[PDB]
Design an enzyme around this catalytic site. Structure first.
Site, PDB file in Angstrom:
ATOM      1  N   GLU A 141       0.538  -1.322   0.398  1.00  0.00           N
ATOM      2  CA  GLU A 141       0.027   0.330   0.186  1.00  0.00           C
ATOM      3  C   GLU A 141       0.303   1.558  -0.170  1.00  0.00           C
ATOM      4  OE1 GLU A 141      -3.066  -0.306   3.002  1.00  0.00           O
ATOM      5  OE2 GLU A 141      -4.591  -1.202   1.935  1.00  0.00           O
ATOM      6  N   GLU A 230      -5.954  -7.649  -1.402  1.00  0.00           N
ATOM      7  CA  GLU A 230      -6.177  -7.357  -0.019  1.00  0.00           C
ATOM      8  C   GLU A 230      -7.867  -6.249   0.893  1.00  0.00           C
ATOM      9  OE1 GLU A 230      -3.249  -5.276   2.702  1.00  0.00           O
ATOM     10  OE2 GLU A 230      -5.155  -4.223   3.490  1.00  0.00           O
TER      11      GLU A 230
END
Length: 312
Positions: A141, A230
């Site tokens: 991320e 995710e």
């Protein structure tokens, strides 16, 4: 009772599509560990066998936090590498696909630990590249207003991919996008030229509604391959709700488009996104009453997706 890897073998990306070794469409569906430094006890063969046989997952994700301030890989490289290898070997032994996730987060620019990432992935590609199970996720991320595709993420990915591809020419690489892997719309302006690359989109159903699905649709139409490496049923914090009505809209949307997805997370933390109730056995075999509301939902989605595949 063929395993997922026996049935599907070496995966390939053509345009936005994930295909198996036999040129058939294939969707990965599974669950991620929480950070291995905090909840690594759940990354083991017994737990993964329950996921394979009872939950009908075909992939597990190993979330190796990097940030030394999170006690991640930069702080304890030996223990975490050992845990990743345990996780990978479990997946190999079970015929499951496995994502090795360089799990950046508060270390928000993937360039911060780029050379450590290259050394880590070089070792993993050398060790495991011969097996079709392995998938490399090179930057969980990326986030921050400076950490954009053109300025920071793409140059990082180009270097790390060239490292991996010098050793493992074929296995899938998942590349993070900006704003916590939301900014998939920026990829089409300058995609990476390499074989078998997919771009991450992450969502949390308490936060991310149809607007992000609309972005994903636009990315697919433009030819950008998407992998949901995710997602959670909570707010983006990992807690709150869960928000299962919205999560259901997402799973229907992803399944309709054949997009691979991995839920966060297989641990027993007291937060809404955790699949297991506190004190759950690290070895699997969990009765429904040892799963959270979220865990029950994920298990149900995985079972239903397999049923829909066998019959449609």
């Amino acid at each position: 009772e063929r395993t997922p890897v026996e049935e599907n073998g070496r995966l390939q990306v053509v345009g936005t599509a994930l295909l198996n070794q036999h040129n058939k469409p294939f969707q990965l569906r599974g669950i991620s560990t929480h950070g291995l430094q905090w909840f690594g006890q759940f990354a083991n063969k017994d737990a993964f066998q329950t996921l394979r046989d009872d939950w009908k997952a075909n992939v597990v994700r190993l979330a190796m936090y990097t940030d030394p301030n999170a006690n991640g890989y930069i702080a304890q490289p030996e223990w975490l590498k050992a845990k990743v290898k345990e996780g990978v070997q479990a997946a190999l032994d079970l015929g499951m696909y496995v994502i090795i996730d360089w799990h950046i987060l508060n270390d928000n620019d993937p360039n911060l630990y780029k050379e450590q990432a290259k050394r880590f992935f070089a070792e993993m590609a050398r060790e495991y590249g011969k097996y079709p199970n392995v998938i490399y996720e090179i930057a969980n991320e990326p986030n921050g207003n400076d950490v954009t595709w053109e300025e920071k993420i793409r140059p990082y990915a180009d270097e790390v991919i060239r490292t991996i591809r010098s050793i493992d020419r074929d296995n899938l690489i998942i590349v993070g996008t900006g704003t916590w892997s939301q900014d998939v719309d920026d990829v089409a302006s300058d995609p990476l030229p390499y074989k078998n690359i997919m771009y991450a989109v992450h969502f949390y159903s308490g936060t991310h509604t149809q607007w992000l699905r609309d972005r994903v649709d636009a990315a697919l139409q433009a030819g950008t391959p998407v992998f949901v490496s995710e997602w959670g049923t909570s707010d983006a914090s990992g807690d709150g709700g869960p928000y299962l009505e919205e999560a259901e809209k997402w799973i229907e949307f992803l399944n309709e488009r054949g997009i691979s997805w991995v839920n966060w997370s297989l641990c027993d933390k007291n937060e809404a996104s955790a699949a297991l109730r506190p004190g759950a056995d690290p070895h699997g075999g969990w009765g429904d009453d040892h799963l959270s509301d979220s865990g029950r939902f994920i298990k149900a989605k995985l079972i239903e997706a397999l049923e829909h595949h066998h019959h449609h």
